[PDB]
């Protein structure tokens, strides 16, 4: 088979990153550990940290688009009622 | 002997304080129409007022009161 | 002992796989029977069998 072009990923042994020198890693066998260590602690304290950092980027846009929706629903209901017949003719016509 | 359970239940909640308010408001609409249908010009005036909205407000109230209780009187 | 338990069921994959299959056969029949029994008992008096015998009195 012919060769291919130049990519930004290789395989095992020639992955294509910088030369590494001075870093050491340690690990323990999974058969000698407790898989469920700290689940109760993380479910409350870690969960509170994650929520507190991102909840402002989601709720503010959501509340803006929900207030817009409710204000448009009430206006339409008032327009097609008996008390809104003076406005329905002056807008839709 | 046994009559319509829904009819007997609807006549009960129509006599409560909240019910008598919605009943009294519907009758005020009927009189405004019962006298406006006997004038020269009502045969053709394009916009003819009705009392559907007042009927809807009262009918909705009896439905919330009677729906949770009706099926316990049946079989 | 825990050594004898490993040596009988967990050392050879053939015994491990055969045990899983034989445990799935037993679970299959028992799980079905216990589910209909609870389901029928929760709806006593509403089944055709219940009403058929009542009108047969």
């Amino acid at each position: 088979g012919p060769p291919s072009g130049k990519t930004y990923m290789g395989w095992w042994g020639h992955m294509g990153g910088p030369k590494q020198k001075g870093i050491t890693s340690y690990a323990v066998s999974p058969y000698a550990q407790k898989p469920l260590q700290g689940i109760f602690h993380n479910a409350v304290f870690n969960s509170f940290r994650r929520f507190k950092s991102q909840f402002l980027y989601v709720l503010i846009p959501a509340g803006i688009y929900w207030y817009w929706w409710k204000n448009g629903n009430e206006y339409n209901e008032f327009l097609y009622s008996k008390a809104g017949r003076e406005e329905l003719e002056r807008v839709n016509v | 002997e046994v009559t319509d359970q829904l009819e007997d239940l609807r006549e009960h909640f129509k006599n409560t304080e909240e019910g008598k308010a919605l009943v009294h408001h519907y009758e005020e609409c009927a009189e405004r129409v019962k006298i406006q249908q006997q004038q020269p010009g009502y045969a053709d005036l394009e916009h003819k007022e009705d009392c559907v909205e007042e009927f809807f407000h009262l009918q909705h109230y009896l439905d919330t009161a009677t729906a949770p209780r009706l099926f316990d009187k049946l079989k | 002992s825990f050594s004898s338990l490993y040596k009988t069921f967990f050392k050879r994959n053939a015994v491990f796989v055969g045990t899983i299959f034989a445990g799935a056969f037993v679970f299959q029949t028992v799980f079905d029977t216990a589910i209909t029994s609870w389901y029928e008992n929760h709806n006593k008096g509403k089944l055709w069998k219940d009403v058929k015998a009542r009108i047969a009195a």
């Binding site: 020198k21 001075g22 870093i23 050491t24 890693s25 340690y26 690990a27 323990v28 066998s29 999974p30 550990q33 898989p35 469920l36 097609y80 009622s81 | 002997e1 046994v2 009559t3 319509d4 359970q5 829904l6 009819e7 609409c29 009927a30 129409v33 019962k34 003819k48 007022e49 009705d50 009392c51 559907v52 909205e53 009927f55 809807f56 009918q59 909705h60 439905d63 919330t64 009677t66 729906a67 949770p68 009706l70 099926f71 316990d72 049946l74 079989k75 | 799980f31 079905d32 589910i35 209909t36 389901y39 929760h42 709806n43 509403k46 089944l47 055709w48 219940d50 009403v51 058929k52 009108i55």
Partner: protein, 247 residues
């Protein structure tokens, strides 16, 4: 649009088949068929329901045999090719009151009564809409409305005017089990029967959903433990940096 042309929203009743562990009340199904045959069947059809599907649900095998044998069905032509007729059998379908649509509109002031095999599933509201429509005919139309001739008033019908008149009146059917047949009792029974016509798999579907959810929930919990066990070495892993000497 206005609330008049929308139609009044039906309330919520406490049906006995509501709930993840609940089935149909088969005594109301049996009673509901009697209401259909004596009141509904004069103008509505059930052509998607076969005679055999009633056996073991609300009637015995012998009862359904005698019910179907009261109608005449077309047979194969004889040796000379002339047409023939035969009594019904368990493999047939429930016949309707009219031969074609022109006949139906002629007997109903030009309006067509719909088929009632999927009517519960084809309306927004389900059982709550059928019950409210059958018991929601006021003795008087609200002051102001002008009904076209030959039409009745019902607040639950979109638009207000409906071509079907009130058909349920107290003590018009004599139940065999002694239940007092009132307007509300008959409207409740015929709605349960029509719901079984639309969803004849309701009882066995809910029993299969119990087994499926129980088994699938266990597997989801077991796979969380297995994933955390296989990832234990990577989750607890340490790195130390000691800068190399210049060379």
């Amino acid at each position: 649009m206005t609330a008049a042309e929308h139609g009044l929203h039906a309330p919520a009743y406490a049906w006995s088949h509501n709930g993840p562990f609940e089935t149909f009340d088969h005594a109301s199904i049996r009673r509901g068929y009697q209401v259909y045959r004596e009141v509904c069947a004069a103008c509505h059809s059930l052509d998607r329901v076969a005679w055999r599907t009633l056996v073991g649900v609300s009637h015995t095998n012998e009862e359904v045999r005698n019910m179907a044998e009261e109608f005449e069905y077309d047979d194969e032509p004889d040796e000379q090719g002339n047409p023939k007729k035969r009594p019904g059998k368990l493999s047939d379908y429930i016949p309707g009151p009219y031969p074609n649509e022109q006949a139906a509109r002629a007997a109903n002031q030009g309006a067509l009564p719909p088929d009632l095999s999927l009517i519960v599933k084809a309306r927004h509201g389900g059982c709550d809409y059928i019950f409210s429509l059958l018991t929601g005919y006021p003795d008087e139309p609200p002051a102001g409305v002008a009904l076209p001739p030959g039409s009745n008033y019902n607040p639950y019908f979109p638009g207000g005017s409906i071509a079907m008149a009130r058909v349920l009146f107290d003590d018009m059917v004599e139940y065999e089990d002694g239940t007092p047949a009132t307007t509300s009792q008959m409207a409740k029974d015929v709605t349960t029967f029509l719901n079984w016509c639309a969803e004849p798999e309701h009882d066995e579907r809910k029993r299969l959903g119990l087994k499926t959810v129980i088994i699938l929930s266990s597997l989801y919990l077991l796979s969380i433990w297995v994933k955390k066990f296989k990832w234990a070495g990577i989750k607890t892993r340490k790195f130390v940096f000691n800068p190399p000497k210049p060379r």
